């Protein structure tokens, strides 16, 4: 998938050109043509079809700078360099900041060409607040250009064609190019958005045999209650027993005036929400992973976390995929490839959260590796079979 990242500088460059191209025989001052293009959404044809048709002191600070700080606008008003700097800078701040800036006397209202607003502003954050502001239309109207999602990031990704794949901004944020959300791989874009419009989950649940209470620290859904009386184990999501889990016959990832909708809804959210809380917990696991690394030999251990973390992601997205799925013969398969993956994940999650330091030092490499290789290989079958899925339309 062909994709490129550009700085606010480069996109401004590109726009500047697209303007200059369009400047004959129209011959307008570059900034007026921008407004005009920006106004037509950058269809250049629609602007054209419509074009052939028809349509020695300084009076601000008061110090005397001799002649050389004095650049003026076309209206003959002549003000000093530092003074402009402040005028522009404070005018590009809220509120009412447009796609332009009028001359400061405000009597004349004749706008200040872009280039000089690039030359004269000093501290470059503001110079960025502008480049964004004047560029924003150029970018939004083109289908090969999308701004990067992060709030404080002014970069833009530019693609060959608008395909809904992941893109990385060196932001270092990654996102779907189509919908601009986080990368979703099993699920379709429209569905995700709908699911988002909806989205409790009970950090406190009680052990089913002894009715004791356990708040959840981590992150693994294989729980072993702490008691002398009952040392028994159970899944967090169904409060039923491990470990018939992830064997063919018990499946904890599958569902049976209609309240049924608001009932079964709670099935899939409860799951997606809980794989999230699970992913949250799995993340504070990184800081812990610098410690027990004690070089190549000893970093498979970031991977385990990388892979465990990755799988929690794909799982949430697989419940979103599944909720909007109407049952059919592939449903029953994907619903299985899921269960394999959910189990491979609870097993590895549970090994890094719990069973590992309660294990010896020699052994932990052999185990962690196999555990996350299988985990990752499960996760790929899930995905490859839904992909081949999307190809036949089967859903
Ligand atoms: Zn001045
Ligand atoms: Zn003026
Ligand atoms: Zn970014
Ligand atoms: Zn998307
Ligand atoms: Zn118990
Ligand atoms: Zn369960």
Curated annotation (Swiss-Prot):
Changing residue 268 to A: Hyperactive 'open' mutant that displays enhanced E3 ubiquitin-protein ligase activity. Its EC number is 2.3.2.31. Changing residue 278 to A: Slightly relieves autoinhibition of the E3 ligase activity by the ariadne domain. The modification N6-acetyllysine is found at residue 44. This is E3 ubiquitin-protein ligase ARIH1. Changing residue 220 to A/S: Does not affect zinc binding and folding. Abolishes ability to transfer ubiquitin and E3 ubiquitin-protein ligase activity. A zinc finger (IBR-type) spans 128-189. Belongs to the RBR family. Ariadne subfamily. Interacts (via the first RING-type zinc finger) with UBE2L3. Associates with cullin-RING ubiquitin ligase (CRL) complexes containing CUL1, CUL2 and CUL3. Interacts with neddylated CUL1. Interacts with neddylated CUL2. Interacts with neddylated CUL3. Interacts with neddylated CUL4A. The lineage of its organism: Eukaryota, Metazoa, Chordata, Craniata, Vertebrata. It is found in: Cytoplasm; Nucleus; Nucleus, Cajal body. Changing residue 25 to A: Strongly decreased ability to initiate ubiquitination of cullin-RING complexes. Changing residue 338 to A: Hyperactive 'open' mutant that displays enhanced E3 ubiquitin-protein ligase activity. Changing residue 214 to A: Disrupts the hydrophobic network. Abolishes E3 ubiquitin-protein ligase activity. GO terms for biological process: PKR/eIFalpha signaling; protein ubiquitination; ubiquitin-dependent protein catabolic process. Zn(2+) 1 binds at residues 58, 61, 80, 83. The chain holds residues 99 to 552 of 557 of the full protein. Residues 7-55 are annotated as: UBA-like.
